Amino acid sequence: YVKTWFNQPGRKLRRRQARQTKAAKIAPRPVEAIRPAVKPPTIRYNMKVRAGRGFTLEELKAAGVSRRVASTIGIPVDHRRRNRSEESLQRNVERIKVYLAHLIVFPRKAGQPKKGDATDVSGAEQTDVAAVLPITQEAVEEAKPITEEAKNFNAFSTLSNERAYARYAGARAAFQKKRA
Amino acid sequence: PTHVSKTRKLRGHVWRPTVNLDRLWTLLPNEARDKYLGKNTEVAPVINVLQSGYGKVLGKGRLPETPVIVQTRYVSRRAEEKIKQAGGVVELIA
Amino acid sequence: PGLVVGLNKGKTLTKRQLPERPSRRKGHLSKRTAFVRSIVREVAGFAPYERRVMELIRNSQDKRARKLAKKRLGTLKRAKGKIEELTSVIQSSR
RNA sequence: UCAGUAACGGUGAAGCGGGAAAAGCUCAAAUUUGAAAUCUGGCAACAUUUCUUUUGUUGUCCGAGUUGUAAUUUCAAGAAGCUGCUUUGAGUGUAGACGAUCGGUCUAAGUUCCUUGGAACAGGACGUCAGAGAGGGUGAGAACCCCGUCUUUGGUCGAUUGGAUAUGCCAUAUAAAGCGCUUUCGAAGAGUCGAGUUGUUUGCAGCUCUAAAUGGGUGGUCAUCUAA
RNA sequence: AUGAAAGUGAAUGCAGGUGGGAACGCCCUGGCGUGCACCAUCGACCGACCCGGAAGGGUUUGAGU
RNA sequence: CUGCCGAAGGCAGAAACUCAGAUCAGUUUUAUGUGUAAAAUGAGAGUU
């Protein structure tokens, strides 16, 4: 059994046409939805930022948009993800805020901009999200002045201590519980 | 190419990557080296080997006397006071 | 300590208290289902091996009682879960 | 890609990472109890159609159904009060534009002269078209004889439609829904999980036995999921 | 890079010296410098092994700086 | 198809660099008893 790749240009052309057909069908709105900024879950990749599946309920509520209408206006919602730190919270919150600020909603039934809509909608144009919302990387630290207490601070001497504390943590954990 | 083979004449014949301090200044761009190396500035340049893809920094090479802050998870034993004798400090990143 | 190694190893950030997830709740004992479980209990009775445990406990041979209960169920935690329940029924009957 | 790595004794992954594509949901478990509000079928009209061939609407009768059909709820929650802001059609014709399917139909210029030859579609001379010098046929190598080819992501015919825009008519909201609070409760799947044993390549099956409700599963007291 | 593994994890001395050594230069054939690569030596450093409580001591070790 | 090199009962060739040598010899002399050592003749000899 062998799997040959003689249809690689054909697959590439078909995917491009499918993207083109998708764009033509839903032209008023961007062809890619808004995605949250999310950090990979490992020690090898926790220094980067990538695109998550969707926002969380806490982020949606903090931004002020309900989880019901969020799907309608094009904001994917993830019910599994949870925010364990405010740093991620206001990070995804400001992603939604800039999305909403740049967002224009065509009024339904074309009678009046009922509450949340756009008065002038003639400026419709299909633009990708990445241009308006360019996902970034972790902020690289710029040059800072020398810190004196850090200068006195050795470095890995500490990592040796808390390491030895960690390895023999059960050793003294026993010691206290047995003598108490 | 079959034509240049041997049978055409046989016819009928039957995770923790590491970096040494010699390469620490290489990580900073050319602009940072030009605007911080070899001169005396109150603010010191910072090197983040973690953002460059390095887990630990090891101790092979020398350094110019320009102070520099090294952000890393693990640091080598006498590489620390290699920074300190060079005038910089290793500030450990989490 | 904002450190890579230690009992509190890792980065230091502002921790947020997560909202309560409803699927974490399962296993709780509602008052209505507890009442209904009482009604079926008094209308159905107990299984044959339960009756043997009553006899064993009323004879006060608890070691054999827990041994046979573990043999019947399969796990010590289930055996203990039985024992406390049928002893709890015992003083109610008394 | 991890990776021919972990693992097993030659077999041989998966997590993470980068991409292609993205869309979420529905029940059982709670009383509508001031009202079975639900549904198939028979009969009679009204319709509508890719269609006299399709699909429905209303009225009436019988039946199903209280051993539970409707509405609300599915754990991301949710219900019950409380609150003051916001939102609303499972409709029916007319017109233009915007696409697409089917087939109908439209296309630029030598057959001029001399030699060879059965035949010129060959050679030479004099010319033309080209958004068309791809290909095929014609008595030998034909852009200009013919079909086609470019124009064509188009003009012209008709018949359909798919979605929107403008416009008209019906609907009935005495309602329904979203959001912030609780002085509230929060029902969640059993011969099923699980254990012992035998069999197959943890997973599955046979058999003995057989659960629980902050319980159960998974990973090294903690973390994460909520099966049958 | 080493270690069974946790792990640690490299120019002392021009990134160490000695001799040979290609080529080059200097004169005045040879001598002189000069020394690539490479080869003989050679000390240090990274470790695993041992002693010491990091310094220091081994003449053990790795197709190591 | 032609040419060149060419065995074996650890070989032949290829590449990388020594010394213009006393560097080797299916050899003969000289000395000590077929072994060893230090004149003849021939050859550019070699090392991983």
Curated annotation (Swiss-Prot), chain A:
GO molecular function, one term: structural constituent of ribosome
Keywords: Cytoplasm, Phosphoprotein, Ribonucleoprotein, Ribosomal protein
Modification Phosphoserine, positions: S157, S160
GO CC, any one term: cytosol
Cellular localization per UniProt: Cytoplasm
Subunit structure: Component of the large ribosomal subunit (LSU). Mature yeast ribosomes consist of a small (40S) and a large (60S) subunit. The 40S small subunit contains 1 molecule of ribosomal RNA (18S rRNA) and at least 33 different proteins. The large 60S subunit contains 3 rRNA molecules (25S, 5.8S and 5S rRNA) and at least 46 different proteins.
Protein name: Large ribosomal subunit protein eL13
Organism from which the protein derives: Schizosaccharomyces pombe (strain 972 / ATCC 24843)
Encoding gene (name): rpl13
From Swiss-Prot, chain B:
UniProt-listed GO biological process terms: cytoplasmic translation
Ranges annotated as biased composition (Basic residues): 1-12
Record-level Gene Ontology MF annotations: structural constituent of ribosome
Principal place of residence: cytoplasm
Additional free-text comment from the UniProt record: There are 2 genes for uL15 in S.pombe.
Quaternary organization: Component of the large ribosomal subunit (LSU). Mature yeast ribosomes consist of a small (40S) and a large (60S) subunit. The 40S small subunit contains 1 molecule of ribosomal RNA (18S rRNA) and at least 33 different proteins. The large 60S subunit contains 3 rRNA molecules (25S, 5.8S and 5S rRNA) and at least 46 different proteins.
Family the UniProt entry places it in: Belongs to the universal ribosomal protein uL15 family.
Name assigned to this protein: Large ribosomal subunit protein uL15A
UniProtKB/Swiss-Prot annotation, chain C:
Biological process terms in GO annotation: cytoplasmic translation
Top-rank taxon, per record: Eukaryota
GO cellular component: cytosol; cytosolic large ribosomal subunit; preribosome
GO MF term list: structural constituent of ribosome
One Pfam family it belongs to: Ribosomal_L36e
Keywords for this protein: Cytoplasm, Ribonucleoprotein, Ribosomal protein
Gene3D superfamilies assigned to the protein according to its UniProt record, in alphabetical order: 60S ribosomal protein L36
Matches recorded under PANTHER family: 60S RIBOSOMAL PROTEIN L36 (PTHR10114)
Subunit structure: Component of the large ribosomal subunit (LSU). Mature yeast ribosomes consist of a small (40S) and a large (60S) subunit. The 40S small subunit contains 1 molecule of ribosomal RNA (18S rRNA) and at least 33 different proteins. The large 60S subunit contains 3 rRNA molecules (25S, 5.8S and 5S rRNA) and at least 46 different proteins.
Functional summary from the UniProt entry: Component of the ribosome, a large ribonucleoprotein complex responsible for the synthesis of proteins in the cell. The small ribosomal subunit (SSU) binds messenger RNAs (mRNAs) and translates the encoded message by selecting cognate aminoacyl-transfer RNA (tRNA) molecules. The large subunit (LSU) contains the ribosomal catalytic site termed the peptidyl transferase center (PTC), which catalyzes the formation of peptide bonds, thereby polymerizing the amino acids delivered by tRNAs into a polypeptide chain.
Other facts: There are 2 genes for eL36 in S.pombe.
Stated name of the protein: Large ribosomal subunit protein eL36B
Gene designation: rpl3602
